[PDB]
């Protein structure tokens, strides 16, 4: 391999250098924005508790104030 050893080793070295270049070149940057995760709850109406107000008396009418 007197006339084969040189070009093969040259190609091997060039491939190694290209691989190193490709790997490290992309590491820079790659983190421009930060996006926080979202964890919401299911907004549904199943078995809602029911509150009832009742006003009654011997009078005809009344004035009523209440808290919703």
């Amino acid at each position: 391999l007197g006339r084969i050893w040189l070009p093969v080793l040259i190609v091997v070295a060039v491939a190694a250098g290209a691989l190193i270049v490709m790997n490290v070149r992309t590491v820079f940057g790659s983190n421009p924005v930060v996006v926080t995760e979202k964890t919401s709850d299911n907004a549904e109406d199943f078995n809602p508790k029911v509150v009832t107000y009742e006003i009654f008396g011997s009078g005809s009418s009344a004035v009523i104030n209440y808290m919703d």
């Binding site: 964890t39 709850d41 209440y66 808290m67």
Partner: protein, 48 residues
């Protein structure tokens, strides 16, 4: 846990919530106080 049953804090459980709801009862009584003030005016007329 028991204080966060669904993973979020229980509603109406902060101290500022208690503070911010302190004046609703006075607002509820407003009509009955206004009626008393009108009665005071009419009583002054009756005195006249």
């Amino acid at each position: 846990t028991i204080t966060r049953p669904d993973g979020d804090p229980i509603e109406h459980s902060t101290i500022p919530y208690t503070i911010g709801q302190s004046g609703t009862t006075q607002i509820m009584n407003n009509d009955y106080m206004q009626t008393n003030l009108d009665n005071l005016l009419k009583q002054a007329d009756d005195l006249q």
